[PDB]
Amino acid sequence: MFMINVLTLIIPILLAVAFLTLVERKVLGYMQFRKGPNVVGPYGLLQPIADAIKLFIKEPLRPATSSISMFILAPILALTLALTMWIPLPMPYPLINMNLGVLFMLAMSSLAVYSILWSGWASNSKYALIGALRAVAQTISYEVTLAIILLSVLLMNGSFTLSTLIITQEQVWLIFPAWPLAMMWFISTLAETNRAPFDLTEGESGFNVEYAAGPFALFFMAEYANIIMMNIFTTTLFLGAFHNPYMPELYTINFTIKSLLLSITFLWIRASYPRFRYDQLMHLLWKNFLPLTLALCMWHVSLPILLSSIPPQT
C-alpha cells in the first residue's frame, strides 16, 4: 500500500514535468505576442508526448567519454535526487514525515552538483568542463544564501519539520515577517535551477551536451522536477495555506494553485530579462545577497528574543 503511495507521488511528478514544457512554450508564446504549440494536439496537448517519442528514438550521439561510469551515473544521480526532494513535502501530509525534512532537502539539493561535475568531467570537451565548473560554482554559491535564509526563516518555525511550517503560518503567511528573505530566497532558487536570468549553460556550452537525446531529456526533466519542487517548497515556506485536517484536499488545491503561479512566475521571469554576465551574478551573491542575508540572520535570531516570540520546539 505504501508502494502505491510512492508511485502516486513519482509518476505524477513525471507527468507534471511533461506538461510543464508545454505550459512554458505556451506562456512564453503569448508573452512574446505569438502563440505556443496548438497544432500537434488540441491546444498543443500532444506536444510533450510527440517530443518524448521523438527524443527516445533519435540516434544516440555516441561520445567518446573520459569515464563511462560517471557518464552513466550523472543522469541517474540527477533523476534520483530530483525525485527524492519531493518525499518530505507536506502537501498536506508528506510521503515520508521526517523530523528534519528541511535539512534533508538542503542536503539532497547540495548533492545535485555532482551530476553537473561528473557530466562535465565525463565529457572529453575541455570547454564543457569549464562550463561545468562555472555551473557548479554558481550553484554552490547560491546554496550559501539558501542555507542561511532557510535558517533565518526556520527561526520562526521552531524545528526543521516541514509539516510544522503549516502550523507556523496558520494566522498569517510567513512572507509578511520575511519578505526580504522571501525575495532573496526566490532569486536564489532561480539561480539554483540554472534558470533565466542565471542560465549561463545556454549563454554564449552546456555541461551535458555530449549526452544523447534520451539522457539529455532525463537531465532536462530532472531540472524541471527541481523547478516545480522548489516552487512547492517556497510555497510551503512563505505562502502556507489553510489546512482543515478533516478536508485535506482544501490544502492540496490551495498549495497547488500557489505553486503553479510560482512556476509560471519562473516562466514569466525568463520572458522578461537578459542574462547576467557570470561575474555579475557572482557580484549579486557575494556582495549583495550574502551581506543582507547575514544581517537578516542576525535580525531573525535576535527578534524572537526581543519580542518574546520564540516558537515551540515540538
Partner 1 sequence: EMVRKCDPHIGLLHRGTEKLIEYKTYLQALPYFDRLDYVSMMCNEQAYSLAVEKLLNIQPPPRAQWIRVLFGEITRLLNHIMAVTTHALDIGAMTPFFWMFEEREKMFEFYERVSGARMHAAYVRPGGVHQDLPLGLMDDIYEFSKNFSLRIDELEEMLTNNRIWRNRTVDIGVVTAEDALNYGFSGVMLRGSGIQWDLRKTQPYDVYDQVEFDVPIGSRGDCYDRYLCRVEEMRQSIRIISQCLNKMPPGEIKVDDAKVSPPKRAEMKTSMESLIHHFKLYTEGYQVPPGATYTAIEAPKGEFGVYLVSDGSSRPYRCKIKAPGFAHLAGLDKMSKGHMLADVVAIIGTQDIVFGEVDR
Partner 2 sequence: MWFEVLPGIAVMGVCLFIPGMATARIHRFSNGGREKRVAHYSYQWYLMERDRRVSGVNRYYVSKGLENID
Partner 3 sequence: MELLQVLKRGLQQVSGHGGLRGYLRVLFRANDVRVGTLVGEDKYGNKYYEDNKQFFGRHRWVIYTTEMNGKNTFWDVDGSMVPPEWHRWLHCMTDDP
Ligand X SMILES: CCCCCCCCCCCCCCCCCC(=O)OC[C@H](COP(=O)(O)OCCN)OC(=O)CCCCCCCCCCCCCCCCC
Ligand Y SMILES: CCCCCCCCCCCCCCCCCC(=O)OC[C@H](COP(=O)([O-])OCC[N+](C)(C)C)OC(=O)CCCCCCCCCCCCCCCCC
Contact positions vs ligand Y (CB under 6 A): 52-53, 56-57, 180, 182-184, 186-187, 197, 234, 238, 269, 273, 284, 287-289, 292
Q: Which does 209 bind (CB under 5 to 8 A by kind): ligand DCQ, partner 2, partner 1, none?
A: none
Shortest distance in whole angstroms from residue 54 CB to ligand Y: 9
Q: Which amino acid is at 95?
A: L
Q: Does 260 bind ligand X (CB under 6 A)?
A: no
Q: Return the residue of 9, 28, 31, 49 that touches ligand X, per CB under 6 A.
A: 49
Residues forming a β-bridge with 247: 244
Shortest distance in whole angstroms from residue 56 CB to partner 2: 20
Is 245 in contact with 252 (CB distance < 8 Å)?
no
Is 267 in contact with 24 (CB distance < 8 Å)?
yes
- C-alpha 100/C-alpha 208 separation (Å) is 32
Q: Does 59 bind partner 1 (CB under 8 A)?
A: no
Three cell numbers at 126?
A: 575541455
- What region does 123 belong to: left with phi over 0, alpha with psi -120 to 50, or beta? beta
Q: Does 94 bind partner 2 (CB under 8 A)?
A: yes
Shortest distance in whole angstroms from residue 233 CB to partner 2: 13
Q: Does 33 bind partner 2 (CB under 8 A)?
A: no
Shortest distance in whole angstroms from residue 201 CB to partner 1: 12
- C-alpha 186/C-alpha 200 separation (Å) is 18
Handedness of CA 276, 280, 284, 288 (dihedral sign): negative
Shortest distance in whole angstroms from residue 136 CB to partner 1: 16
DSSP 13-77: HHHHHHHHHHHHHHHHHHHTTS----TTTGGGTTHHHHHHHHHTTSPP-----S-HHHHHHHHHH
Residues in the site for partner 2, rule: CB under 8 A? 1-2, 4-5, 8-9, 12-13, 15-16, 19-20, 22-23, 26-27, 29-30, 35-36, 38, 43-45, 86, 91-95, 97, 99, 161, 163, 228, 232, 245, 248-249, 251-253, 255-257, 259-260, 264, 314
Residues in the site for partner 1, rule: CB under 8 A? 31-34, 196-197, 199, 203-204, 271-280
